[PDB]
Design a binder for this molecule. Structure first.
Ligand SMILES: [O][C][C]([C]OP([O])([O])=O)O1O[C]1[C]([O])[C]OP([O])([O])=O
Ligand SMILES: [O][C][C]([C]OP([O])([O])=O)O1O[C]1[C]([O])[C]OP([O])([O])=O
Ligand code: G3P
Ligand code: G3P
Ligand code: G3P
Ligand code: G3P
Ligand code: G3P
Ligand code: G3P
Lengths: 235, 235, 235, 235, 235, 235, 235, 235
C-alpha cells in the first residue's frame, strides 16, 4: 500500500503540562491529525508522565478512529500497562540512541513474546545497524523503527548522505530478514522526502516538527502538508 | 478607552526547547501576533533560561514592530540586561503570586528609578491588594499588573464573581492613585471578557491560552480571536 | 454579562448511531464548538440511548473545557446518573412540551434538592407560562429554560410576534422571582435574534439548526455564525 | 477513464427527518457534492421513507447536474417509481447483504429488462461471489456493485487483506464477463485507497463516511478529500 | 427588528439563460444566500421568461428556507400565477421608473385585494413620491418599495444627497401613513449604507451588485459582505 | 505535452451588460484567471457588441500578462481591428458550428496571410471533420480549434464516446498535417478530462462553465479547479 | 457620517518599476482594494514617473469603480494632466513636509480655481499648522489633508500624544473655517485608530503600511483589516 | 532528485526601503517562504545597501531554518563579509548580464578558493555561454547559475524557444564538466516549467515574480504555487 504517517502528539501534552490546565488536549489533536493525513497516532508513556498521562492514554484508546502506537520502555510497569491497554502497536524504546537489542536478547525476546500474547504488534526502535537489525528479527519482533535522528542532526551534506545510505541500506537488509520497517525521529518538512523515498519504509512516525509547525499554521495543515510531501517523495 | 492586547510568546519557546532544534522560533510568532491583534509582545527572561533565551531577546528587540515587555525578577543581572536592552516596558515579577512591593519598598524604589532612567516604563506585577497598590504608587512605578490567576482558577461560579469584584475594586483603586493598570495570567478565551469589561484596564497580557489555541487553529486566528473578544467586551 | 450559547451535540450522535460506526464522534464536535463560540455543551441522555450514550457522557465529562448541561427526564435512573456524573448543569425535561412543575411540586422539589445536594445547578424546562414559572421558583430551581418551540413553529408572522411577546413577558416575570432564565428548542439562524434581544436571557441552548448548518459549512463556522447573530442582537 | 465517485446523500436526510424541519436539504448537499468531486449522486428510496422522500427524488431529478443513482429494493412499487423517474442509474438492493440473484434469476431478469426498457442502466448490488456475479451477467445487468461491507468491518488486518483479495478477484472475474463494476458500503477515508487501486472499478459509491466528515469540515472539503484519495490510489 | 436583506437572484438565471445549459442554477444560489445573510429571496417572473423561469419558481417555492418575494407586472397572467404560487410576498412592478399607482387606482386596488385574498403580502414598487406613496396606502397595499435607482445613478454628490433626502423624506411620510417600507434597485457596496441608515427601511432588496461581486468572490461572501455593511450602517 | 488553459471571459461582460453599470469588469476577471491557472485569455468581439466591447479589448490588450486570443468573424471590420490590436492569437469563428474553410478557401487564405503579416497566430474554429482540417492546413493556418459542442451535448453515454472518438481521430489527423490543435466550447468540469487526455491537444478554450462555477465559488477557485482537472487527465 | 478609506497604491508600482516588468499591475490592486474597504484610490503621478505612470493613470481612470484622488505637485504640466484627466479629487503636494501654501498664496489660488473650473475637488496637503490652514482657507481649497507623518514617526509615547493633540486641534480649527479635513501619510495598523477617532476626519489616505502588510497577507485582507480598525475607532 | 526552490526576498526590502520604515521585514518573509516550499533563501547584499542591509543578513543568518544563499559582487569587502558570515552558498554576480568569469580568471580563481576555505559553496552567475562555462569549470567553482533573463524577456514564441534550447544545451554542457547547475532570474509563473523540466537543474532561484504575486495573494500562496508548478514540470 502507500507510505503511512503516524503522528506523535506527545508535544501537544508538553504544552499542556507546562501549566497544569487542561488545554491543549491531546484527544482533540488526535481527531484533527487522523482527519488530516495521519494513519495512526503515536503516544509515548514515560515513567515520569512528563507529557502524556494515563488519562490521555485511556481516553485516546476509546476515541482514536485509526490505531494507537504506544511508545514505552521495556520495564514491568509498562509491559503491564501495554498488556491491559491492548494498543494496536507498541514501539519499545530506551529508558546512537536506539534500543540495545543485540545486547539484551532474552529481555527483548520475552517482551515481544508477552506483548504478542496480548495481541499487540511489536516494533523495536533501533539504530540503522545490521547487528541490531538481525537481533530484532531473531527475538521475534515483526517491526523495527529505524532511528532517523543522526540523519536529521547531520551537520554537513556529506554527513547527511552518509546517514541516508546507512538508513536505506539498513532498511533493505531488515526487509530481507522479513521485518516490516518504520522510521522516525527528527524528521522535518525539509528532510522527510529522502527518507520517504526509501521503498522498504512502511510508516514514518513524526512528532516535534509537526507540532512545531502547527503552532504557526494549525495542526490540520501541518499534518496534511507532511503527508503530501511524503506521498510526493514516493511518486 | 481602547484596550490593548499583549501576547506572551514564552510558550512558543518552551515547545522549541523540548527538542533543542531551532523551531518553533519565537521571532516568527511575534511577527504573526503583531499583525493579528497584538499591540505588544511579552517575553519572560527566566534565570534558568528554560524557554525564552538571550538570543531570543536580542533578535526580538530588533524584529518587533510594536514594543517589548520584558518580564523579569528584580535582581542585578536582570536589571543590568534590561538597561542594556532598553525594552519599552518592564514588568517586575517574582521568581498570592504577585510581587511583595510593600515588603521591599527600597529595592523596588531603586529598581524603578534605575529602569526609569533608562527610558523603561515599569510595571509591577501585583495581587489585587490595596496595600501593594499603595506601595506601587508610593514607590513610583507608572504601571501595575493585577494578577488574574486566582480569578482564572476560581472553581465555582461564586468564588469567581468574588475574585472579579476584588480585581475590579483594585483596578479603580489603582486608577485613583494615578497608576495605569494592566492584568494578566490565567486569562482564557472563556474568562477574558469579564476582565476586559473593567474600565480601568489598560492592557491584558496573555500567553498560555493563546498558544494552546494556536496549536489547533494557528497563531493568527488564535490572537485575532482573543482581541475580538476583548473589544466586544468593552463595547 | 455576555449572552451565552450552549451547543447541543445530540445530533452528531444521531448521525453516528444510524450505522454502528464510531464517527462522527460527539467528543470531537464538543472541542470544535467550545473553541468557536460555545460557552457550554449540552447532551440529552435518553433512556433508549437513541443518540448520546453512557460512553459519550463519561468521556465528555472528562474532555469538556467549559461545562456540561445534562438534559434528562425526572426518573430515578437519570437522577442517579446525574448525581454520579456531577454535571455543572442539569436540565430536567419531559420523557406544549414543558415540564408540569405546578402539578408535581413534590417530585420536582425532591429532584431539585437532590441534584442541588450533588452540586448540580438545576434548570426546569418549561413553557412560557407564569404558573409553571412561579412553581419552578417555589420548588427551588435556580434556573428555568423557556420552551421556544411554539415561537419557532409560528405559522404566521402574527402567531410568531404573539409567541415572542409571551416568552419575553414570561422571562421578565421569571427574573423578578429571582430565576436565571435560558431558552431553547427550535431556534434557528433566522429566528434567534428576537429571542437573544430579550434582556433577561442568560443562555440559549441550540442544537439541530447548528448541526444542520454544519453538514454544509462545518461545525466551527456554524457555531461562530450563531454566536455572532446572538451578540449582534444584544448590541 | 477516471475512477468516479458517487456520493450518497441519504444521511443528509437522516439528520433532517429527526425533526420535521426542512433542513438540512438533500437538494443543497447534492449541488455542493457535484461541484466538489462527485460524478454522480446516490439516494436510497426506502419503503418506510426513513430519510429520502418522494419530494427529494422528484426535486433532485430536476436539479442534479450529473446523474442520479436510485437505490431501491426489487418490488413492484419501486420499479414503477423508477420507470416514471427515469434515473440514469438504478442500483437494486435487498429490502452478507448482497442481492440473491443466482437464486432469483427470473425476478432479476424481469427487473433488469423492465428498467432497461425504461432507459435505466441497471446495477445489481451483490457480494464478492462469482456465482452471484456470473448470474448478474446472465440476467442481463450492465453493472454490479460489489459489497465492500465485509472488507470494511474487517476486525484484523488479515481478515481485511483477505476480504480485499476477494473483492479484487471478484472484480476481475466480473470484468471478464463484460460487467462494469462499482463498489461501495462502508468505505472510509482510511480504507478507500486499497479499493480505488483495483483497476476494474468504475465508480465507488460512498455515503456515511463523507457525511460524518462533513459535520466537522463541511461537505465540500469532505467530498474533495475523498476524490483526491481515490485519484491518488489510481496514480 | 433589524434591517432585512432580500437577495434578488435573477442574474444567476441571466448567466444560465445565455446558453441554455442548466448552470448556474438559481436553486443553488438561493440556498447559499439564505445561509450567508439573506432574509428572503427575490425573483422576478418576466412575461418573456428572460432569466427566471416557471421551473425555477416552482422548485424555489419548495426549496427556500426563508420566504419568496415574487416580482411581477400587474397583468391577469401574473396575478393567476401569484395566486397559485402563494409566495409570502409579491412586489408589483411596471410592465422615474416606479409603478404608476396614483394614475391606476382601481387596477391597483383590485390586484392588492386579490393577492391578499390568496394570503399574499403585497408591496408596490414606486418612486420616492408622496402622491404615489399616498395612493399606495389608499389602494390598501401593506408595503411599498422605494425605487433607489435615481439615487444610485446620481451623477454628482449634490444629485446624490438630493436623491437621498427625497428617499429618506419619502420613507418617513410612508411610515406615517402606516405603510411598511422597503428599498432596492441599484444598491451597491459603496452606496448601500446611507440607504440602510434610514430608520423606516424594513428590508433592502438587492440583486445585480451582489451577483456582480459573486463572480469574483463567491456568492456566500458577496452576500455576507452586503449584510455586514447594512447592519454597520444601522449601528 | 503541457496542456494550456485559455479562459474565455465573455460571460463576465454579459453579466455586466445586463445592467449598464461598469461591474463586473472583464479586466478584473482577466487578472484573476491569469493568476489561477489561465495561460491565455479569450474574448469574442461580436459585431453587435453584446458582451465584450471595444473598451474591453483596448484595456485588456494593455492589462493582460499572458496573451490575448481574439475570437471574431471573418469580415473586413474585424480583420481591420485585429491588425490594429495585434492580439497574440486570433481565432476565426462564424457569426456543425465550425467555420466553413473548405467552402471559402480564398477568403480564409487571405484572412490568414493578412493576420499572419501582422504577427498574429491564426486559429480556425472548425468541426472534427477531415475535409475542413485538410482545408485549414492547405490554407496556411498555424492552428485549428476543434468544436467540442456536439461532444458536450451528446445526450447518451454512447453518443458521447462516439463524439470523443471523432474528436480524437480529428486531432491526430490535424497533427499529422502539421497543424497545432486546440479545442473549446461546451467543456465543463464534468466532461473536460476525456478531452484533456487527447495527446494532440495544445490548449482548451473554456468559458461559460468556468463563469457559471465562479458565481458560486469565485473565479479564482473556478479557474484553478479546471486547470487541476486538465493536468490530472494528462498525467 | 461614514469615515472613508482611500488606498494609495503607489508602492505596487514601486515594486513593479524595480524590474521593468509589467507586474504587479496597479490596475489589479485597485480592483482588489475597492472591493475590500477602500472608498477611493489614490495615486501620486510624480514628475519623474518613478512609480505610477501615465498609462497607470489613463487606464485606472477607466477602471476605477469608485473615484480617483490624484496626488501631484503644482506645475503647469500636472495641472494640464489633472484638468484633462478629470479625477474626482486632486491633492496638491510638494515635490515638516507639507505644501507651503502660505508662502505661495498666488500660485495655489490659481491652482485651486483652475482645478475647480474643471470640476475637480481640491485638497491641499499641509502640516498641522494654523498659518498654513488659514492660508488654505483663504486660497479657496475645499479640503486639506493633515500630514500625520510627525505623529507616525513619534518616538516616545509623550512625543506622540503631543502630535495627536496637534492634529486634533488643527482638525477642529480647520473645520471652523469651513474646510473639510482628511489625514494620512505614515498611518499604520497600530497608530490609525487615534487618528480615525478624530471626528472632523472625512477620509484617511493610506498606502505604504497597507502594501507592506499585503506582501504577507495579500492585499484584500490588508485593506479590510485597515477599514475594520478605522470603523472600530469611530464606534 | 528533488528540484529545489530558492526564494529571493530582496524586493521585500525594496518595498521597505522606499519609506525608511522597518516594515515589511525580510526576516518575516523568510519564515513564511521556508514553510511554504522554499528550500533556501537568497538575499543580494548590494554594495550600496539599496534593499537588503547588514542587519538583514546578520539576523537572517540567525533565523533561517534552511540555508542562506548570499548574492554578491566580487570585492574584498564582500569576500570578508561572506567569509565572516559563513553562508551555506554564495552566488557571485556582476555589480547579457552574466558575470564575466572568462575575462577575470585570476580574480575568480582566488574568490572561489577563498570562499571555499571558509566552507562556502560557490556558484557563479553566468550567461548560457560555453566560454564562460568552461571558464567557470577551470576556476574551480562547484556551481553555475544560468541567467534565464534572455529567456524571460523573449518576445516571440520562436525567440523564446531558441533561448530555452540554449539554456538546456548549456545545462547539459555544464554538467559534462562536473559542474552542478542552477538557474533563475526573470522566472515567472508562466515561464518556469519549461526551465524546471531541464533535468540538470538543481535549484531555481526566483524573487521578483513571487513577490509581485505576493502583494495580491500573500507570500505563502505565492511560494507554494511556484513550488507546485516546478514539481509538476518534473513529473
Ligand atoms: O514516534 C516517533 C516520534 C518522532 O518524534 P519526532 O521528533 O521525530 O517528531 O518520536 O518518539 C519520540 C518521542 O518519544 C519524543 O518524545 P519527546 O517528547 O520526549 O521528545
Ligand atoms: O428586487 C430588487 C432588485 C434589485 O436589483 P438590484 O439591481 O438593485 O440589484 O430588483 O428588481 C429588479 C429586478 O427585476 C432587476 O431584474 P433585471 O434582471 O431585469 O435587471
Ligand atoms: O496568559 P498567561 O497565563 O500565560 O501568562 C501571561 C504572561 O505571564 C504575561 O504577562
Ligand atoms: O435547538 P434544538 O431544537 O435542537 O434543541 C435544543 C435542545 O433541546 C437544548 O439543548
Ligand atoms: O458509504 P455508505 O456505507 O454509507 O453507503 C454507500 C451506499 O450504500 C451506496 O450508495
Ligand atoms: O467554454 P465555452 O462553451 O463557453 O466557450 C469557449 C469559448 O467559445 C472560447 O473558445
Ligand atoms: O500611507 P503612506 O505613508 O504611504 O502614504 C499615503 C499617501 O501619501 C496618500 O495620501
Ligand atoms: O527572480 P528574479 O528575477 O527576481 O531574481 C532572482 C535573483 O536574481 C535570485 O537568483
Amino acid at each position: 500500500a502507500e507510505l503511512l504517517l503516524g503522528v506523535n502528539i506527545d508535544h501537544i501534552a508538553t504544552l499542556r503540562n507546562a501549566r497544569g490546565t487542561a488545554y491543549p488536549d491531546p484527544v482533540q489533536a488526535a481527531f484533527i491529525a487522523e482527519q488530516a493525513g495521519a494513519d495512526g497516532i503515536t503516544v509515548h508513556l514515560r515513567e515520569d508522565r512528563r507529557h502524556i498521562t494515563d488519562r490521555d492514554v485511556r481516553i485516546l484508546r476509546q476515541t482514536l478512529d485509526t490505531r494507537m502506537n504506544l511508545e514505552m520502555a521495556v520495564t514491568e510497569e509498562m509491559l503491564a500497562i501495554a498488556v491491559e491497554t491492548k494498543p494496536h502497536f507498541c514501539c519499545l524504546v530506551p529508558e546512537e540512541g536506539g534500543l540495545d537489542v543485540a545486547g539484551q536478547r532474552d529481555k527483548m525476546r520475552d517482551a515481544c513474546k508477552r506483548l504478542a500474547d496480548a495481541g499487540i504488534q511489536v516494533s523495536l526502535f533501533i539504530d540503522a545497524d545490521e547487528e541490531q537489525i538481525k537481533a530484532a528479527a531473531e527475538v521475534g519482533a515483526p517491526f523495527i523503527e529505524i532511528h532517523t535522528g543522526c540523519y536529521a542532526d547531520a551537520k554537513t551534506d556529506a554527513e547527511q548522505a552518509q546517514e541516508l545510505a546507512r538508513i536505506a541500506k539498513a532498511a533493505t537488509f531488515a526487509a530481507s530478514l522479513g521485518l516490516k520497517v518504520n522510521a522516525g525521529h527528527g524528521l522535518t518538512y525539509h528532510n522527510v522526502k529522502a527518507i520517504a523515498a526509501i521503498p522498504e519504509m512502511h510508516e514514518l512516525n513524526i512528532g516535534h516538527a509537526i507540532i512545531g509547525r502547527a503552532v504557526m499554521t494549525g495542526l490540520k495543515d501541518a499534518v496534511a502538508e507532511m503527508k503530501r510531501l511524503m506521498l510526493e517523495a514516493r511518486g
